[PDB]
From a paper:
We focused our attention on human [name], an ATP-dependent recombinase crucial for homologous recombination (HR) and for error-free repair of DNA double-strand breaks. We therefore explored the possibility of using a more stable orthologue as a surrogate and focused our efforts on archeal [name] from [name], a protein that was already structurally characterised and is closely related to human [name]. Here, we describe the complete process of generating robust, [name]-like surrogate systems from this archeal protein via two distinct approaches: by stepwise mutation of the surface of the [name] to humanise the BRC4 binding area (HumRadA series of mutants) and by generating an archeal/human chimera (ChimRAD51) in which all of the BRC4 binding part of [name] is stabilised by parts of [name].
The structure of HumRadA2 also highlighted the need to introduce further mutations at the back of the Phe pocket (particularly V232Y216) in order to force I169M158 and K221M210 into the same conformation as observed in the HsRAD51:BRC4 complex. Overall, the structures of the humanised [name] proteins are very similar to each other, and significant differences can only be seen in loops that are involved in either crystal packing, or are mobile and poorly defined.
Author numbering: 108 to 285, 310 to 349
Write the structure that this text describes.
């Protein structure tokens, strides 16, 4: 399968990422609360549903939520401001709340069966969001005696996510706090800045973007 790319909505950020977030990859976006990481997840959940000429992959979305960050009204807003049907865009997002780290791991293992079901349809899954990758692991595995089990379980979880990305030709997008690593920070005037770091086949760099009624854009 040739790698597909989903536009972030920001031309500057897309350029930094080599065209958009990639299928067959995990993109891991770091930042503090309000940094833009969750706004970017909501934007991508709309963009991926568009045709390739408009920056999408005609795809369905799966959203695994660990910190109650998914906002259906934000999806509706982004969809409408981009001239799309809000009800239709929302219907193509399969939402699952993860109650703890073990459940989060199970949901990703169970996702394989769901991906197979839409694989040869008009709207195969093309994007899996995990917002956030680590909140449950950090809340549950505190201190020295818990570190080994936490790193082993997180490494297994990441392997399971990579397997989904590669087997079903989807982009996996996950958020984190301090894979293709992007770090977000506050810029000037409410702008946000993304920095791509340690990418094997993309140079490091930065992109400035805005959060608007359309989600993310330059
Ligand atoms: Ca955010």
């Amino acid at each position: 399968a040739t790698i597909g790319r989903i536009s972030t909505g920001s031309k500057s950020l897309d350029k930094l990422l080599g065209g958009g977030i990639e299928t067959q990859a995990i993109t891991e976006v770091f930042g503090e609360f309000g940094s833009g990481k969750t706004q970017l997840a909501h934007t991508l959940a709309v963009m991926v549903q568009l045709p390739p000429e408009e920056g999408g992959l005609n795809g369905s979305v799966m959203w695994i939520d660990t910190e109650n960050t998914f906002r259906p009204e934000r999806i509706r807003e982004i969809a409408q401001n981009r001239g799309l049907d809000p009800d239709e865009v929302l219907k193509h997002i399969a939402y699952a709340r993860a109650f703890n780290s073990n459940h989060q791991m199970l949901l990703v293992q169970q996702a394989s069966a769901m991906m197979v079901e839409l694989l040869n349809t008009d709207r195969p899954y093309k994007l899996l969001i995990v917002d956030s990758l680590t909140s449950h692991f950090r809340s549950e595995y505190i201190g020295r005696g818990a570190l080994a089990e936490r790193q082993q379980k997180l490494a297994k979880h990441l392997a399971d996510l990579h397997r989904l990305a590669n087997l079903y030709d989807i982009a996996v997008f996950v958020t984190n706090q301090v894979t293709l690593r992007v770090y977000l920070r506050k810029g000037k005037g409410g702008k946000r800045i993304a920095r791509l770091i340690d990418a094997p086949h993309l140079p490091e760099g930065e992109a400035v973007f805005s959060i608007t009624e359309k989600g993310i854009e330059d």
